[PDB]
């Protein structure tokens, strides 16, 4: 069977995804065909070579330069309405992308994304809409990227009661905390990280706990099927003694709390360097621990590719 | 969506499964209906209360002792043919149950199991049969029990090439090796383990690496879709220095090797207690680490329940 895929967004994650798809376009009795790609500059739509498009975007930073394919100025809504892919893959930084998803799901087009806010903020509407149009929504790389914590929660532990999830999901903050442990001030450590590309020049999504908050919210959705009643979002700006501290996202029924935690040397949450980690507590299993990378092009595109296959094959969305 | 389930075997695992099915009989749009339970004493079949049957077997030791249901003495083939369930659940210690699986699958009856040898030895025949009869096969609790290593490998990482897997999958051997580490002889360590509940009167399959080898073989099937060419099995009996040693299953394309390995102090495979672990190495993610309990009744039944749901909902088997 053949499936048509519109990729929406084409930055680090989207370009890595094109590689993965190109290397594995025929797999699991499926053929993956990318019929469109979109960035801010525009949309290409037709018979283009996927790695060729990646190359030209890699050098030039836009889809315009492609030889002999020509650009279309579609709105998100037009792109879906006109291209009519079977699968819409959002790998963009467009926070307000839920409106585009609504349209796609209306036409029974499944959505795959790595873009958090639409899932964190509109999870319920999007799920209902999906079920109503014999379609699916997939978001694995919205949490710990390619490391399959969403698979584990969504499609497994199906007889468990999840009492708690704790997770360290920002490598940058483990870096900052480690430097502080070694005697640097927070502000120095931040300066080091920004100059290293570990942090952005606006570091708030890491330092103020916002990325983790969105990830806690998504986890809360999957595990409990409703928005939380209680929210506590904090970052690391108040940390003084940073020994054995990590920025931890904790999820329990009706509660999300992102904040710094001092951890025993024993704790698998006490991750080193760039490693992310999640400890899931259940009634029958005690702790299940999952660790892996939390970012990177190929790492993130890995999750999305898993989701493309599931969408194509219409895997049930149970949670 | 109502589903009819035959449970084959009723020991620690099957009795704990009963508990779980009773508390969660309606979930995810499914009504789970248990129509037959079978042990060596024979087979009950009908309108019987699930927890009651658990209760009589609990105390008495057999199934025959129930009220208002004649026990039938059915062979495995007769059980499938006469009961006609939608899903056959094997939680027995019968090494040769694959022949029964072949029957069910032939009738489009899906199979869920925690029983290792049939999957280790007949996985391809079983997958081909299931495919030809619009049926599935699920075996999560054959490796690390409820700890969902199978879900992770089988239904996720779908864009990955699995470079390797290292795993410690026998809590019993951890205990033994730890005790040898502290000065105890093999035999004294074994006797302590028995007294603790940690080993059976025949520990041989765990001690000699046959269990792990079965497990390694299952992981190899999931990851590469064929048997290995190189096979090495070595148990713990003859370890002279057990310091920081575990019984590690190593899996790579074409290759399985179970043997005691000395590990660094920070190695995640350096597990304690009941805990099992798998370190999965893939081309895009590097290391994914999954840990959790490896045995126990409710732990093992958790994985089987997950599989029951997926069989009922016709989850794809991509690997
Ligand atoms: N990098 C990582 O490790 C991870 C990233 N993610 C998430 O995946 C998404 C992509 O990440 P990443 O690839 O690093 O980000 P990049 O900034 O590298 O790429 C973002 C892409 O989206 C495009 N875009 C942004 N807004 C719009 C819009 N309104 N319409 C059309 N296109 C738009 C960008 O266009 P332009 O360049 O033209 O502005 C660019 O092509 C993000 O939401 C991120 O949070 C998730 C997990 C890991
Ligand atoms: N417990 C654990 O931690 C784990 C177990 N498993 C596996 O799950 C399975 C169940 O283990 P568990 O419940 O602990 O073991 P038990 O020995 O407690 O139960 C085994 C069951 O199988 C029955 N049985 C064996 N052979 C036959 C047969 N030919 N016909 C009918 N019934 C039969 C037994 O009957 P009788 O008592 O009458 O002999 C018993 O009810 C095993 O294959 C085991 O390897 C896998 C992972 C973890
Ligand atoms: N490595 C990222 C996670 C990407 O979703 C961060 O914590 O900011
Ligand atoms: N962890 C268990 C494995 C049972 O499948 C043991 O020690 O045998
Ligand atoms: Na993920
Ligand atoms: Na398992």
> Which DSSP string do the residues of B73-130 spell out, in sequence order?
---HHHHHHHH--SEEEE-S--TTTHHHHHHHHHTT-EEEE--HHHHHHHHHHHHHHH
| Pair B156, A151: CB distance under 8 Å | yes
Regarding whether B144 and B17 lie in a shared domain, the answer is: yes
Mutation pick for ligand 2 pocket among B16, B60, B92 (CB with most ligand atoms within 8 Å): B92
Regarding whether B303 and B179 lie in a shared domain, the answer is: no
Regarding whether B194 and B135 lie in a shared domain, the answer is: no
Pairwise CA distance, residues B255 & A28, whole Å: 23
| Nearest in space to B87 (alpha carbons), one of B32, B45, B132 | B32
Regarding whether B192 and B266 lie in a shared domain, the answer is: yes
Q: What is the CATH number of the domain that holds B40?
A: 3.40.50.720
In sequence order, the 6+-apart residues with CB closer than 8 A to the CB of B299 are A284, A285, B145, B146, B147, B293
A147: chain B residues, CB-CB within 8 Å: 285, 288
- Top residue of B15, B25, B141, B285 to mutate, by most chain A CBs within 10 Å, is B285
| Pair A294, A268: CB distance under 8 Å | no
> What is residue A265's three-state secondary structure?
coil
**Closest Cβ opposite residue A158 in set B156, B268, B306:** B306
Declared resolution, Å: 2.4
Regarding whether B2 and B147 lie in a shared domain, the answer is: yes
| CA atoms within 13 Å, Cβ hemisphere of B229 | 2
Q: Enter the tokens of residue A296.
A: 């990177």
Q: What is the CATH number of the domain that holds A220?
A: 3.30.360.10
A152: chain B residues, CB-CB within 8 Å: 148, 151-152, 156
Regarding whether A150 and A165 lie in a shared domain, the answer is: no
Regarding whether A167 and A54 lie in a shared domain, the answer is: no
Regarding whether B10 and B33 lie in a shared domain, the answer is: yes
**B60: how many CB neighbours lie within 10 A of its CB?**
12
Q: How many domains does chain A have?
A: 2
Regarding whether A183 and A90 lie in a shared domain, the answer is: no
For residues A112-127, b (16+ Cβ closer than 10 Å) or e, as one string?
bbbbbbbbbbbbeebb
* Bridge partners, residue B230, by sequence: B255
Contact residues of B toward A, CB < 8 A = 20, 24, 27-28, 140, 146-148, 151-152, 155-160, 268, 282, 284-293, 298-299, 301-302, 305-306, 309-310, 313, 315-316, 318
Regarding whether A300 and A182 lie in a shared domain, the answer is: no
Regarding whether A23 and A145 lie in a shared domain, the answer is: yes
Q: By residue range, what is the domain housing residue B105? A: 1-158+293-319
Residue B128 CA from chain centroid, whole number? 21
Regarding whether A92 and A21 lie in a shared domain, the answer is: yes
**B127: how many CB neighbours lie within 10 A of its CB?**
18
């Amino acid at each position: 069977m053949k499936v048509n895929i519109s990729i929406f967004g084409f930055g680090t994650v989207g370009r890595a995804l094109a590689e993965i798809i190109a290397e594995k376009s025929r797999i699991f009795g499926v053929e993956l065909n990318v019929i469109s790609i979109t960035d801010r500059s525009g949309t290409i739509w037709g018979d283009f070579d996927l790695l060729e498009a990646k190359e030209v975007a890699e050098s030039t930073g836009k889809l315009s330069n492609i030889g002999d394919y020509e650009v279309y100025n579609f709105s998100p809504q037009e792109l879906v309405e006109e291209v009519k892919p079977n699968i819409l893959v959002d790998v963009s930084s467009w926070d307000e992308a839920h409106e585009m998803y609504k349209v796609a799901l209306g036409e029974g087009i499944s959505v795959v994304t790595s873009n958090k806010p639409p899932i964190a903020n509109y999870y319920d509407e999007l799920m209902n809409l999906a079920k109503e149009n014999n379609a699916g929504i997939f978001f694995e790389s919205t949490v710990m990227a390619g490391t399959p914590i969403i698979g584990v929660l969504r499609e497994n532990l199906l007889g468990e009661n999840i009492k708690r999830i704790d997770a360290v999901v920002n490598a940058s903050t483990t870096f900052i905390l480690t430097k502080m442990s070694e005697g640097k001030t927070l502000d120095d450590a931040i300066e080091e990280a920004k100059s290293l590309g570990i942090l952005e020049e606006d570091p708030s999504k890491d330092i103020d706990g916002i990325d983790a908050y969105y990830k806690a919210k998504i986890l809360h959705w999957v595990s409990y099927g409703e928005p939380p009643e209680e929210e506590e979002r904090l970052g690391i700006r108040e940390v003084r003694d940073a020994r054995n501290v990590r920025l931890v996202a904790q999820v329990s029924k009706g509660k999300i709390s992102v904040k710094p935690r001092k951890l025993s040397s024993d704790n698998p949450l006490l991750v080193e360097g760039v490693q992310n980690a999640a400890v899931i507590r259940t009634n029958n299993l005690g702790e299940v621990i999952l660790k892996g990378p939390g970012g990177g092009g190929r790492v993130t595109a890995s999750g999305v590719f898993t989701d493309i296959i599931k969408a194509t094959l219409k895997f049930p969305n149970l949670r």
